[PDB]
Amino acid sequence: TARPLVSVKALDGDMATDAAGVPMPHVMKAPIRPDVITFVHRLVSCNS
Amino acid sequence: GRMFAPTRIWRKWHRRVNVRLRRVAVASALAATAVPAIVTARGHRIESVPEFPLVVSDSAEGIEKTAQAIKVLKQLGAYADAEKAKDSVGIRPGKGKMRNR
Amino acid sequence: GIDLVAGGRNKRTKRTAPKSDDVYLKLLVKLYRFLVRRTKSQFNAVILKRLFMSKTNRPPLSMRRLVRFMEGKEDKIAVIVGTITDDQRVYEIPAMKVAALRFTETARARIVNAGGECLTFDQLALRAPLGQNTLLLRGPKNAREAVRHFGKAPGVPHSHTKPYVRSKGRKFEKARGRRNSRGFKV
Amino acid sequence: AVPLLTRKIVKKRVKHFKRAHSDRYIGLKQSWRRPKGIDSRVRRKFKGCTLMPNIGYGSDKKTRHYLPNKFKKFVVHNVSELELLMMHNRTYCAEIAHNVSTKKRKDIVERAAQLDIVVTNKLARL
Amino acid sequence: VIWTESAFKKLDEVYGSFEASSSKKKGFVLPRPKMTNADLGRLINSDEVQ
Amino acid sequence: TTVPGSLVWELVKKNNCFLIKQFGNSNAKVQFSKEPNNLYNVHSYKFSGLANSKTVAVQPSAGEDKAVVLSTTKTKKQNTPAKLQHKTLMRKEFRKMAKSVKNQVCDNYYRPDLTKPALARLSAVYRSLQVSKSGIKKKNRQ
Amino acid sequence: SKMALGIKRASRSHTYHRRGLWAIKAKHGGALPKAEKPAAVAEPKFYPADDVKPRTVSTRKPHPTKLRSTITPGTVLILLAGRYMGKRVVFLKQLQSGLLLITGPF
RNA sequence: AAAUUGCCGGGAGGGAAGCGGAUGGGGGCCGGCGAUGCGCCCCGGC
RNA sequence: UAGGAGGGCGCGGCGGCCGAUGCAAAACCCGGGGCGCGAGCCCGGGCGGAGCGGCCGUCGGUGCAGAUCUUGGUGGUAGUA
Ligand SMILES: [Mg+2]
Ligand SMILES: [Mg+2]
Ligand SMILES: [Mg+2]
Ligand SMILES: [Mg+2]
Ligand SMILES: [Mg+2]
Ligand SMILES: [Mg+2]
Ligand SMILES: [Mg+2]
Ligand SMILES: [Mg+2]
Ligand SMILES: [Mg+2]
Ligand SMILES: [Mg+2]
């Protein structure tokens, strides 16, 4: 039961708020599969 | 004369991918967006960006102008990568420059 | 000149590496090349070459068949280089520790909810670097539909080979050569 | 500037493998094509006929792709690509690409001077 | 990718987790890897293997 | 390297923005890597400035005389690109800078790997700074 | 005697005599000496990128060149080449490099 | 661009020429075509 | 040989990356220097005067010596009949 909090980057003109980091989404921790990417990228690209 | 095996419009132009395989590949792509070494290796100048993933507040949502957008990229470490894109624009070598590309 | 067949060179072929350019399976292979190299576990040699295998040489194993094969040996880890599929026809499953390349979602839930473990092969090498206290299992290789069509031809004596036919019914591959009233009975 | 190679470069053949009968026709190119003819005496390797390339002619793997300079070449287009040879200066020699202008070449030569990088077309375009 | 805070918080809604019927998408569960920890350094140089 | 380095090497080995490969995929292939934290500019996982959390950089500074910049990244700041790098500007003498490089590359067990390469790149970087200023004197062919 | 000498040389006893491990058993008492560890320079002026390999001052000790049996001092030699080709000279002695010392006399 | 042609310069020829291996003679071309630096030292300054 | 497979070379687009070019791009020319067993490739010199290249993935109207091959151009025949 723990996951890091992603710091949100403020911008000039913002009201200073007692905010905290957003926990990391589960998808941003999914397996990295470059074979699947290039297969799907090839087939999807030809549909236009 | 006519060409050998004249091209026909009933070639297989569009190919299908399983709905689930599409979703799996999107998941893998999203994860890699959160790895600085891979975002670097794919050619993005990310060297003054504070953190990956790079999350900016909702106040960006309401901006209006390209000039306003430029400040936001400057306050991040993002404007340098946008610099490279604009500086790299040139005319496409080959036949495509007369095929509307 | 020296009297030899093809210069004495090997003409058989075996997979020295896997076909898929899957990054995680590539990482697993580097681990087991090291393990076979330094530990000399015979178990480790089997696991390595099974990692170099095509989808049809690594058939799935159902949880019903796995539960049968584990019965009474629940102090050991089941090892399958392949997929564990869930089986609805089973009711009793013991708490069991299973290592496999993949688990279906329903299978993994069934195993965990029994109080078992769904191990990966990296995790296995931590908990058994020499495959000690393991039950190494394959699935049924000759259970595919394609296998029915293999062997002696459909129309020779004593063969029970499945013919390639586009449909079933009385009009498809039943008359001459399949019964005595129409020519001959195969 | 001093090359590492400490072994003489042996070539098993210096002549090229010209195409058979390209000396007899004009529209035949000199680039090697292996004869596939049924009666081809080149293909059947009779003595006194033109030779065909084999793997046996292959040059020693140690001194392969080394120029007579005893450096291996790497073509550069700009100063940045030159600076990749900083730590290989005794094995690799730079060579400016054929379409790099005179202005750009002066820079590469100036920068290659400091890093001590052998450059084999240092006088071109000047 | 530059995520807005509005969008980065919707990701868990859109893709869910390693749990059934958590995604906004139907019939989908995030894919699991073949190797839980990919660090060949840690596995090869753990006490168990050495 | 928010994922392991062994994994990252798998992804960036065959293609990435820093690898300049020439002369095909035959036995004539020549390939270098122009990323700035690769000491020999070699496309290998040992020298990769991409697939390592611990890497060493030895660079001549921008327009300035005799300043060598030494950089080492931080293992626990991998996801903070801006403040991942710890860089040091040294304009001291060579043998004194050879000490600083050992202090931060070798003696702390950072990358005992790159003890020889870091010093050798310092030797080459430092000499290029003298020659830039003093001008070419020697030819070095002997 | 080529083989007879060769057999003698590789004898375990006689190589001990030849090398002189006796009289090195003398100096450093009832033991055979130890050594130490040089190369504590701590002062590299340069750092080569090639895997360095240093200069050879060879310990190999090539045998001296042989003198032909009939070249004995006082014998008259004929020079076969050089600017004195055909000249008949006097053989004095063999030198350290193996070259023969000769005189016309002038 | 090539096929093919003219002029100038060079080369060889007893019923073909061209070709493969050798080398010898001529040409023509190659200065990363081929080095002059490193270690002890004595000053005289940086 | 017939035949099968692997690994490469080369041509033109598309998605990406990395670059050259009026301080001279492409194409073409050369008794110029080289690399590779080879397909081919790199550089020099010239001509030209505005575009071009390498790498990863992917795609195709993608490689010629023949076909009494198609079209065009050109010889010898011959200053002859
Ligand atoms: Mg019968
Ligand atoms: Mg025949
Ligand atoms: Mg012509
Ligand atoms: Mg003439
Ligand atoms: Mg001849
Ligand atoms: Mg000759
Ligand atoms: Mg086309
Ligand atoms: Mg065609
Ligand atoms: Mg033709
Ligand atoms: Mg043909």
* Residues of chain F neighbouring G48 (CB-CB closer than 8 A): 120, 123
Contact of B77 with F81, CB cutoff 8 Å: yes
Rounded to the nearest 10°, the torsion over CA F105, F110, F114, F116 is: 40
Distance CA G95, CA G73 (A): 12
Roughly how many angstroms between the first and final C-alpha of chain C, as a whole number? 52
Distance CA C86, CA C64 (A): 8
Distance CA C72, CA D107 (A): 78
Per the structure block, which two tokens stand in for A21? 């980091």
Say whether the CB atom of D7 is under 7 angstroms from strand I: no
Rg from Cα positions in chain E? 17
* Residues of chain D neighbouring F117 (CB-CB closer than 8 A): 87
The 3-class secondary structure across chain B, one letter per residue, is: CCCCCCCCCCCCCCCCCCHHHHHHHHHHHHHHCCCHHHHHHCCCCCCCCCCCCEEECHHHHHCCCHHHHHHHHHHCCCHHHHHHHHHCCCCCCCHHHHCCC
Distance CA C70, CA C62 (A): 12
Query: Which residues of chain D between 35 and 94 are close to nucleic strand I, CB under 7 A?
Result: 35-38, 43, 53-55, 57-59, 63-68, 73, 75, 77-78, 80
Distance CA F28, CA D65 (A): 7
Question: Is the peptide bond prior to F36 cis by the omega test (within 30 degrees of 0)?
Answer: no
Contact of B79 with B61, CB cutoff 8 Å: no
- Please report, for residues A21, B35, B66, B76, B85, the alpha-carbon distance to residue B73 in angstroms, rounded to integers and kept in the order given: 20, 20, 11, 5, 13
User: Residue holding tokens 């329903």?
Assistant: C106
**Cβ separation of F3 and A32 shorter than 8 Å?**
yes
Distance CA D63, CA D32 (A): 24
Question: Based on the number of CB atoms within 10 Å of its own CB, is E32 exposed (0-12), middle (13-18) or buried (19 or more)?
Answer: middle
Residue C125's CB is within 10 A of a number of other CB atoms, namely 26
User: Residue holding tokens 């539909």?
Assistant: C145
Per the structure block, which two tokens stand in for C177? 């050569």
Per the structure block, which two tokens stand in for C28? 């697993």
Residue C70 three-state SS: helix
Distance CA E33, CA C66 (A): 22
Contact of C35 with C62, CB cutoff 8 Å: no
Which nt sits closest to D79, CA to C1'?
I19
Which nt sits closest to D29, CA to C1'?
I65
**Cβ separation of E12 and A6 shorter than 8 Å?**
no
Closest CA to F8 of E15, E18, E29, B31: B31
Which positions on chain I have an atom < 7 Å from some protein CB?
1-2, 7-10, 12-26, 34-45, 51-59, 61, 65-66
Instruction: Please count the CA atoms within 13 angstroms of the CA of C61 that sit on its side-chain side.
Output: 27
Quote the strand ranges of chain G, DSSP E: 76-78, 88-94, 100-103
Neighbour order of strands in the sheet with F68-73 = F56-60, F68-73, F85-90
Distance CA A7, CA B57 (A): 10
Smallest-distance ligand from the CA of D25: 9
Residues 6 or more apart whose Cβ sits within 8 Å of residue A47: B14, B15
Residue C71 three-state SS: coil
Per the structure block, which two tokens stand in for F29? 């292939």
Q: How far is the CA of F14 from the C1' of I56 (A)?
A: 8
Rounded to the nearest 10°, the torsion over CA F128, F130, F131, F137 is: -140
Distance CA D106, CA D78 (A): 10
Quote the DSSP letter at residue F28. T
User: Residue holding tokens 């590789």?
Assistant: G10
Kindly give the distance from the C-alpha atom of residue C155 to the centroid of ligand 1, in angstroms, as a whole number: 9
Distance CA C127, CA F11 (A): 28
Which positions on chain H have an atom < 7 Å from some protein CB?
2-4, 18-22, 32-39
Distance CA C32, CA C131 (A): 12
Residue A41 three-state SS: helix
Kindly give the distance from the C-alpha atom of residue D25 to the centroid of ligand 9, in angstroms, as a whole number: 11
How big is chain D, counted in residues?
126
Residue E41 phi, psi dihedral angles, 5° rounding: -60, -50
Contact of G89 with G77, CB cutoff 8 Å: yes
Rg from Cα positions in chain G? 25
Which nt sits closest to D93, CA to C1'?
H32
Distance CA A5, CA G3 (A): 84
CB pairs under 8 A between F and G: 19
Instruction: Please count the CA atoms within 13 angstroms of the CA of C158 that sit on its side-chain side.
Output: 0
Distance CA D9, CA D25 (A): 36
Per the structure block, which two tokens stand in for E39? 């660090």
Distance CA D53, CA D15 (A): 11
DSSP F72-128: EE-GGGTT-STTSEEEEEE-S-HHHHHHHHHHHHTTTSS-GGGHHHHHHHHHHHHHH
Tell me the nearest-neighbour CA distance from F58 into chain E, angstroms. Answer: 26
User: Residue holding tokens 């058939």?
Assistant: C59
- Please report, for residues F116, G13, G48, the alpha-carbon distance to residue D1 in angstroms, rounded to integers and kept in the order given: 21, 53, 13
> Which H helix or E strand runs over F2?
none
Strand partners, C178: C185
Quote the DSSP letter at residue F58. E
* Residues of chain C neighbouring E40 (CB-CB closer than 8 A): 27, 30-31
Contact of F69 with F60, CB cutoff 8 Å: yes
Per the structure block, which two tokens stand in for D77? 């287009």
Residue type, G58: S
Q: How far is the CA of D126 from the C1' of I50 (A)?
A: 23
Distance CA F66, CA D3 (A): 28
**How would you classify residue G29: left for phi > 0, otherwise alpha for psi between -120 and 50, otherwise beta?**
left
Contact of B55 with F79, CB cutoff 8 Å: no
Angle at Cα C79 formed by Cα C78 and Cα C83, nearest 5°?
A: 110
Angle at Cα C122 formed by Cα C67 and Cα C142, nearest 5°?
A: 45
Positions at the binding site of D for Mg(2+): 39
* Residues of chain F neighbouring E40 (CB-CB closer than 8 A): 4, 6
Roughly how many angstroms between the first and final C-alpha of chain G, as a whole number? 42
**Cβ separation of B56 and A40 shorter than 8 Å?**
no
Kindly give the distance from the C-alpha atom of residue D29 to the centroid of ligand 4, in angstroms, as a whole number: 28
Contact of F56 with B81, CB cutoff 8 Å: no
Q: Are strands F30-33 and F19-22 parallel, antiparallel or unpaired?
A: antiparallel
Kindly give the distance from the C-alpha atom of residue D54 to the centroid of ligand 2, in angstroms, as a whole number: 22
Residue D95 phi, psi dihedral angles, 5° rounding: -150, 125
Which chains have at least 3 CB atom pairs separated by less than 8 Å from chain B?
A: A, E, F
Give the residue whose CA sits closest to I1 at C1'.
D38
Residue from the list D81, D92, D114 with its beta carbon closest to the beta carbon of F132 = D114
Contact of C77 with C130, CB cutoff 8 Å: no
Distance CA A27, CA E9 (A): 12
Residue type, G42: A
Closest CA to C115 of C137, C93, C100, C132: C93
Distance CA G21, CA F23 (A): 61
**How would you classify residue F24: left for phi > 0, otherwise alpha for psi between -120 and 50, otherwise beta?**
left
How big is chain C, counted in residues?
186
Per the structure block, which two tokens stand in for F69? 């910049």
Give the residue whose CA sits closest to I10 at C1'.
F24
- List % helix, strand, coil for chain E (3-state, nearest 5): 30, 5, 65
* Residues of chain B neighbouring F51 (CB-CB closer than 8 A): 37
Contact of A10 with B57, CB cutoff 8 Å: yes
Quote the DSSP letter at residue E47. T
Give the residue whose CA sits closest to H38 at C1'.
F142
Contact of F127 with G45, CB cutoff 8 Å: no
Interface list for F 6-35 with D (CB within 8 A): 20, 22, 27-28, 30, 32-34
DSSP chain D: ------S----S--S--PPTTTTT-SSS-SS------SS-TTTTT-TTS-----GGG---STTTTB-TTS-EEEEESSHHHHHTTGGGTTTEEEEE-TT--HHHHHHHHHHHHHHT--BTTTTS--
Residue type, G27: K
Distance CA C34, CA E44 (A): 8
Residue F33 phi, psi dihedral angles, 5° rounding: -130, 125
Rg from Cα positions in chain D? 21
Question: Based on the number of CB atoms within 10 Å of its own CB, is B50 exposed (0-12), middle (13-18) or buried (19 or more)?
Answer: middle
A15 touches chain E (CB under 8 A): no
Which nt sits closest to D80, CA to C1'?
I19
Positions at the binding site of D: 39
**How would you classify residue F98: left for phi > 0, otherwise alpha for psi between -120 and 50, otherwise beta?**
alpha
Quote the DSSP letter at residue C153. -
Residue B17 phi, psi dihedral angles, 5° rounding: -120, 145
Closest CA to E6 of C169, F90, B61: B61
| Resolution at which this structure was determined, Å | 2.9
Residues 6 or more apart whose Cβ sits within 8 Å of residue C82: C58, C59, C60, C61, C100, C101, C102, C138, C139
Per the structure block, which two tokens stand in for D99? 């379409």
Distance CA C102, CA C153 (A): 37
CB pairs under 8 A between C and E: 48
Residue D114's CB is within 10 A of a number of other CB atoms, namely 18
Quote the DSSP letter at residue G70. T
B29 touches chain E (CB under 8 A): no
**Cβ separation of F125 and D86 shorter than 8 Å?**
yes
Residue from the list E29, E32, E36 with its beta carbon closest to the beta carbon of C122 = E36
Q: Which residues of C93-111 are buried (b: 16+ CB within 10 A; e: fewer)?
A: beebbbbbbbbeeebbebb
Q: Could you give the residue ranges of the DSSP H alpha helices within chain G?
A: 2-9, 12-19, 24-27
Kindly give the distance from the C-alpha atom of residue B2 to the centroid of ligand 7, in angstroms, as a whole number: 15
Roughly how many angstroms between the first and final C-alpha of chain D, as a whole number? 23
Distance CA E20, CA E26 (A): 10
Give the residue whose CA sits closest to I39 at C1'.
D32
* Residues of chain A neighbouring F11 (CB-CB closer than 8 A): 32, 34
Query: Which residues of chain B between 20 and 59 are close to nucleic strand I, CB under 7 A?
Result: 42-43
Residue C178's CB is within 10 A of a number of other CB atoms, namely 16
**Cβ separation of E5 and B33 shorter than 8 Å?**
no
* Residues ending a continuous segment of chain G before a break (C–N > 2.5 Å): none
Distance CA D114, CA D1 (A): 12
- Report the structure determination method: cryo-EM
Distance CA A11, CA B58 (A): 9
Which chains have at least 3 CB atom pairs separated by less than 8 Å from chain F?
A: A, B, C, D, E, G
Contact of C47 with C41, CB cutoff 8 Å: no
Kindly give the distance from the C-alpha atom of residue D27 to the centroid of ligand 3, in angstroms, as a whole number: 13
Closest CA to F3 of C23, B49, C117: C23
Residues 6 or more apart whose Cβ sits within 8 Å of residue D63: D5, D7, D8, D9, D10
Query: Which residues of chain F between 6 and 65 are close to nucleic strand I, CB under 7 A?
Result: 14-15, 17, 19-28
Question: Is the peptide bond prior to B53 cis by the omega test (within 30 degrees of 0)?
Answer: yes
